[PDB]
């Protein structure tokens, strides 16, 4: 069947907007997954998943009559995919269980893994996700092997279908660098957002970069993309090493002996893959990565056996059975036991990547201190496995049930608590009004606002309003909101803020965070009475002011906003086309196209421009709530070119008589373009929508106040 | 961005059942396009379009002044695109304004006339659809130029995105026939469900078959595609040569001047493409086709023109300036208007398909007897505009405003007014007890009103319970109906009718339409109580039945299923697996993924397979409404295999001992393969959902039996 796609393959994709519609979810309308999970019989829970630990399936055999390293590795992969960029990836969805992460090469076998945890999904049903689902088995395997875990957190809401994620454009799986599709460039520079080194791969190659099996080149790669995915080196080290302390790899047999991955698996497969041919296809016969590697002497017991062995031995190039390269342990004893056979036992073996870990310079020093004192190891890595396994649940309000650690960490990104009588609905009035009195602009208090607000992204959770953060460093030196400008702004409001607080009794006050929210509410307000019409926007107090040393500046990093075309603003020249990059802002923010399209339209003629730009600011009453922008768009009596001097920047003339308009962008153009975007500009471009286009600009601006108000949920 | 369709092309999608959600609607969710339609002033709007004819835009500039002939063509594109096979396609919403066909190349230039409708479309905003606007233009440019059309309903809603049509598979525009992806076999079969010849083209190639200038051979295609449209060979004929007495064709020169189709066009274009570097680029150098084809005298007149040139005169192949063929008037004067210059005129001019009308034996007397009766071809005309316009708009409950005309057509499949007291709530529950009392099973019941319900498409709006059509033919002898056991069942269920209607005064009636839906509720109800649940199942009567004479046998014929999945059924073998019959199935039911999961489920265990089947029977409890599909389908403790009979069943054994527990088909097996299907009967398959389950039943089954119920909408 020819589609769309296969006609136009470069035309924009809306469909990333629509995901995860009421449609595809078999949930009620109504339900509430957090009411759910608090009253599941979590200790319940546990103790089935302690019980599974040690109960093998003969469909696939336990390793050592334990699952525990399968399902370590199981909850690594989920969280494993996330990447600091752009916030997508990470465990908080549960998208291991649908494609495409469901059938990547690096998660072989964990079809196996999550299929030994129906029973118990089964039995607890909606009230345990199997997003929490596999965390939770994670630290079960952890705490049954004798390792104490940080904590857990639930509240991760199932998903019902897959992501629309960039994962990279090569067409081959595991495609290594330098073809037509390569993801590195340079000096190997591994492009924006992505974070893992070959299609398919969680982080890096096992063997080594491309397969090259140098322990100090492959330190390079794993540094680079652990920190992709947050992770500085003393985590890394704690959680490769941690890792590595259980289980085993497996491969048995040639890898041309395994089958079609799940989603291209016969439908009596029923959602597995990776059948192999290989002996029994299973327990001592499996293969998974290629690689015949286990670590420790007592693969299912936590101890310091990986740095010890580590350390304890010399290594030789090897193969494994697959012939895929890994190392031998130099003149060792057969110490290691074998998975099934008790007569047999193995000499130490180690990955390219665990080699590492000592061969590194950096690394070498972080992994002898964990040596010399594994207590600082385990420490390490029970905080790196939570940081892991939480990265991207946002804000510590989501967090729920009995086992939530109580340390605040500073990469949650914290807010403090709130520990006074907020503002009511008059004391709001009175300080909308005292805003507007100020003579700040309808231009200035929306775009500051928007500045605040829009840093949020629904991938991983973070960013938002609450905290005030606009007003430490790095925000407040961001290019996208104008520092100058800025600081100018929330020195008024400031004021304003210590007069109300000054003047209360009983504790009452308002936090600067609320207020900068608030005065954008004011400055819509006034620009809907700019227009003939008196509307009141919502406002929702109950944001507090974080501290700059509650603040990550460098985590804070990866939420600048480089593209912003609610702003138009472009930091500089990207080979995706602006409107692509807007339609990435608008599904991190959580937009529907109809959302994104009076938004972009209201900002416009609102004065939320970077620098005062006039593009797309197609009106003659600047700073009035009006649906300007799309009449004037969608009037033929115009005629739009692009610049000799800039491709991408258009003029608008009139038809007749070559007077110029106006000047625009792509990204306001897009709207008078895209077949789906102008029937949506049309609707608000119509003689009888100057009510609707309000109500409905007012509805998204308070939407995107609100993204981070998970102490509301 | 290498997506999953790349990975695994032939993967089941489901994207089409969540096509349409409230996400990429802009309208609220209450918003009732009927009621904003029913006070549109629509005298208005007609007039606005009277003037807009002769007014004149200088960059698309209107043939001989008047943009009669376009809107037409415009109009008769929008209406077709429509396939009797499934229903897709034509006017009813607004498709012709996205992607593929506002760019398939029979369509170019039509997005000037969209553009030329937009100010009128504007002014009057929600009020009038642009699927309407389509239509409506149609009918006054006929009108303004001097044709009374039959009438005009209103009521087709606005679309906010691209259908998931099969246009074809050929992956070149407009390629010919016998290629790798080839719409034709053996003696010039087209495959269903496509009604055009080529891919792009509304129905036949103007120039022949495959470009072969061939009268004869040309009306062949002609007769099979508009058969594939619902038209026979009188309506054919009139439809053809009505629409061909106005306007022209546009070929002034080489083709290859013409540009990028709107989906391809740069983003300056604003919509619009076909962008002409030949001479003006529009008006008199204007090219569309290719061709230059002029019909009338007075081509922005009605007349009588057409068949007196058809027959008046012999004719000659020629080529038009761009080196299409068509057909020129031997030794005529020069008579036709030219469309810009008062001082030239042109010999009368005919495409190939213009003298399939002549050449054609069976056309040639219909032509002939029009050319001799001018009256009755304008009827004939009138009446087959109609219906182009008005056939996938449904039930004549849907028609709106002050237009419509009052004859009632056959091929509207009537169903007559209800003049009686309806059945109240004590009325159902004595039906009920009397359908349970006569013996009648819950297989049967269930079966039977399944079979009545699930022939609604919401494609056309054709099909479902009202009417009681199931006792007619031919829907009485269809195989998946079972014939044999409906007949059993209707004749009960007639006898309970009788005998309650003859009890009755005050001129209560119960319809057999209602009685067949009703004892199916019955069923349901007893399917729970045989499970130990109380259930109510909603019902509504005011359903009518359809006399054999209101029942078009040869139209009802596409209806038929030939595959029906709820039922576990394929009539033979296909080229496309039965699972994604089974989507496209759902779709037509304008259900979404969790209906289909949540209905198939339960159909199985009550007994809906055709021949009592017991693949997909995975229950111990048949006739107990239970959630044993899901929660047996997913056990693990069962494989399943392929047969070595039929590659298409399965059987499920048990894993420990080999023994068989159950057989099924790709139908019942994709729902444990598919990684977002088995996501859904992982739900309604754990332990704490039999209630969400039945529910979830009971609301499907619902929706099924009042799709049709416009007269409640
Ligand atoms: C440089 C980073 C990493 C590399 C290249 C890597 C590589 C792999 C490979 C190739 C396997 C064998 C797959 C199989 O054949 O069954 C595996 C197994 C495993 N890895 Fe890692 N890994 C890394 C980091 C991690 C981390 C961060 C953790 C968790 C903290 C983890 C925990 C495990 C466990 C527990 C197993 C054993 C699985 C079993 O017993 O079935 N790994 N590793
Ligand atoms: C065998 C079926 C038909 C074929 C092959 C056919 C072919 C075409 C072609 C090739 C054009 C020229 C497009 C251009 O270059 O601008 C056209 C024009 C047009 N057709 Fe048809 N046609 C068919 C049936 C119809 C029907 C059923 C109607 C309406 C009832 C219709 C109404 C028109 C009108 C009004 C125009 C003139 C457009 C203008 O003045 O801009 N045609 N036809
Ligand atoms: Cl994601
Ligand atoms: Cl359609
Ligand atoms: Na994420
Ligand atoms: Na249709």
Not at 143 to 148: C, D, R, T
Not at 428 to 433: N, Q
Request: charged share 25%; with cysteine.
């Amino acid at each position: 069947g020819t589609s769309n796609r296969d006609w136009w393959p470069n035309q924009l994709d809306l469909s990333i907007l629509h995901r995860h519609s009421s449609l595809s979810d078999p949930m009620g309308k109504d339900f509430n997954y957090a009411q759910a999970f608090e009253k599941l019989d979590l200790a319940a829970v546990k103790r089935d998943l302690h019980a599974l630990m040690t109960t093998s399936q003969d469909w696939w055999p336990a390793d050592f009559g334990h699952y525990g390293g399968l399902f370590i590795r199981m909850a690594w992969h989920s969280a494993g995919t996330y990447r600091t960029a752009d916030g997508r990836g990470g465990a908080g969805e549960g998208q291991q269980r649908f494609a495409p992460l469901n059938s990547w090469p690096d998660n072989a076998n964990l079809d196996k893994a999550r299929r030994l945890l129906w029973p118990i999904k089964q039995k607890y049903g909606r009230a345990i996700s199997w997003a929490d689902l596999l965390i939770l088995t994670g630290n079960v395997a952890l705490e049954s092997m004798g390792f104490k875990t940080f904590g857990f957190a639930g509240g991760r809401a199932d998903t019902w279908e897959p992501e629309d994620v960039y994962w990279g454009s090569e067409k081959i799986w595991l495609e290594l660098s330098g073809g037509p599709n390569s993801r590195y460039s340079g000096d190997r520079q591994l492009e924006n957002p992505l974070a893992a080194v070959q299609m398919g791969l969680i982080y890096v190659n096992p063997e080594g970069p491309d397969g090259n099996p140098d322990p100090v080149a492959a330190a390079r790669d794993i540094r680079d993309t652990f920190a992709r995915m947050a992770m500085n080196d003393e985590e890394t080290v704690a959680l490769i090493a941690g890792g590595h302390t259980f289980g085993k790899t497996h491969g048995a047999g040639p890898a041309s002996n395994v089958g079609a991955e799940p989603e291209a698996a016969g439908i009596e497969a029923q959602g597995l893959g990776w059948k192999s041919a290989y002996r029994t296809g299973k327990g001592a016969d499996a293969i998974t990565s290629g690689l015949e590697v286990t670590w420790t002497t007592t693969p299912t017991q936590w101890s310091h056996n990986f740095f010890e062995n580590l350390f304890g031995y010399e290594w030789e190039l090897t193969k494994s059975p697959a012939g895929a390269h890994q190392w031998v342990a130099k003149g060792a004893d057969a110490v290691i036991p074998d998975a099934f056979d008790p007569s047999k036992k193995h000499r130490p073996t180690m990955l390219t990547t665990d080699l590492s870990l000592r061969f590194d310079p950096a690394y070498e020093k972080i992994s002898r201190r964990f040596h010399e004192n594994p207590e600082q190891f385990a420490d390490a890595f029970a905080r790196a496995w939570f940081k892991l396994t939480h990265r991207d649940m946002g804000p510590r309000a989501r967090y729920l049930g009995p086992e939530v650690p109580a340390e605040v960490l500073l990469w949650q990104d914290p807010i403090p608590a709130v520990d006074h009588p907020l503002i009511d609905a008059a004391d709001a009035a009175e300080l909308k009004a005292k805003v507007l009195a100020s003579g700040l602009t309808v231009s200035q208090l929306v775009s500051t606002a928007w500045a605040a607000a829009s840093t949020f992204r629904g991938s991983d959770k973070r960013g938002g309003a609450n905290g005030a953060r606009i007003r430490l460093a790095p925000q407040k030196d961001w290019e996208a909101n104008q520092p100058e400008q800025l600081a100018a702004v929330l020195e008024t409001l400031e004021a304003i803020r210590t007069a109300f607080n000054g003047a209360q009794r009983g504790g009452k006050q308002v936090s600067l965070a609320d207020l900068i929210v608030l005065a954008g509410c004011a400055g819509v307000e006034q620009a809907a009475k700019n227009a003939g019409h008196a509307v009141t926007v919502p406002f929702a107090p109950g944001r507090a002011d974080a501290s700059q040393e509650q603040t990550d500046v460098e985590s804070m990093a990866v939420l600048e906003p480089v593209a912003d075309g609610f702003r138009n603003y472009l930091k500089g020249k990207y080979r995706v086309p602006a409107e692509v990059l807007l339609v990435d802002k608008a599904q991190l923010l959580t937009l529907s196209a109809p959302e994104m399209t009076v938004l972009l339209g209201g900002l416009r003629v609102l004065g939320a421009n970077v620098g005062q730009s006039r593009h797309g600011v197609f009106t003659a009453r600047e700073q009035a709530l009006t649906n300007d922008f799309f009449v004037n768009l969608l009037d033929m009596g115009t005629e739009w070119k692009p610049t000799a001097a800039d491709a991408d920047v258009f003029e608008g003339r009139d038809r007749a008589t070559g007077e110029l308009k106006w000047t625009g962008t792509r990204v306001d153009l897009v709207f008078g373009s895209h077949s789906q975007l102008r029937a949506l500009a049309e609707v608000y471009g119509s003689a009888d929508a100057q009510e609707k286009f309000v109500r409905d600009f007012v509805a998204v601006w308070n939407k995107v106040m609100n993204l981070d108000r998970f102490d509301l949920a």
